[PDB]
């Protein structure tokens, strides 16, 4: 599995400013990672960075944009999904990490 085609569906639009996000999409094609979730600031879903997803590790790494380089699973607050049609991410109920998770946000006190 992957979530490259959803992940560039949100950036391209809902997310983001033609320069910046022509750049991230260019970090995404060179990645050869299958899992890429957003960080958000807060509930309002803003865009601040994008994320790869080690299965390995379990850590969350710094592709692109404004965020912590590592992120762990004590790290994260809240896990989000990607509504294409409605083109809005809504959250979904605190699970174990998984490919259906698109995006997050992490503890306040971690900015």
């Avoid at 959803?6 to 910046?20: D, F, G, K, M, R």
């Avoid at 750049?23 to 807060?42: V, Y």
């Avoid at 803003?46 to 850590?59: I, K």
Wanted: proline share 4%.
């Amino acid at each position: 599995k992957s979530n490259k085609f959803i992940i560039h569906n949100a950036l391209s639009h809902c997310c983001l400013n033609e320069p910046q996000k022509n750049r991230i999409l260019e970090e995404i094609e060179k990645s050869k990672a299958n899992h890429f979730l957003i960080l958000f600031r807060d509930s309002s879903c803003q865009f601040r960075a994008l994320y790869t997803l080690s299965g390995e590790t379990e850590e969350l790494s710094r592709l692109a944009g404004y965020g912590p380089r590592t992120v762990t699973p004590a790290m994260v607050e809240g896990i989000y999904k990607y509504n294409s049609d409605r083109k809005r991410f809504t959250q979904i109920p605190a699970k174990t990490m998984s490919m259906s998770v698109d995006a997050f946000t992490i503890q306040g006190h971690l900015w």
